[PDB]
């Protein structure tokens, strides 16, 4: 997303995705392996219709 100035992204699933970033945050993204601390984000998906 940061590469494209419009912060738009494309995916093989047919979903256009827009990424907005807030960077003041200690948020944890948890999984079976490790807890990744990163800046929060939001992902919108456009209407491919």
């Amino acid at each position: 997303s940061m590469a494209a100035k419009n912060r738009m992204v494309k995916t093989d699933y047919g979903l256009h995705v827009k990424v907005m970033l807030d960077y003041e945050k200690t948020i944890t993204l948890q999984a079976e392996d490790g807890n990744l601390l990163m800046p929060d984000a939001t992902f919108l998906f456009e209407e491919t219709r």
């Binding site: 940061m2 392996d33 490790g34 807890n35 990744l36 601390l37 990163m38 800046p39």
Partner: protein, 82 residues
């Protein structure tokens, strides 16, 4: 060296050529020795449970522009005693 020497190493395109699975072992070997390291990699992500802790940075520079954009993370891992 002395008692206080920080064991520093570096790696470029780190561990490229190792299979996607076994890269887990390498970071275990590194941790056991206690190295402080600065690595880089085009595809690797450092999200491996064997890592006791690890800072990350992603460098973005679109094609030729004269600026570099840096995103920061951190990882702590859950080395699998299972």
């Amino acid at each position: 060296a002395g008692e206080m020497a920080p064991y520093i190493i570096s790696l470029d395109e780190a561990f490229a050529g190792v299979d996607e699975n076994n890269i887990r072992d390498m970071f275990e070997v590194v941790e056991q020795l206690g190295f402080n390291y600065i690595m880089n990699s085009q595809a690797l992500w450092g999200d491996y449970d064997t890592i006791s802790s690890l800072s990350i940075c992603e460098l973005v520079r679109p094609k030729n522009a004269d600026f570099v954009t840096v995103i920061r993370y951190q990882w702590d891992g859950k080395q699998r005693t299972f």
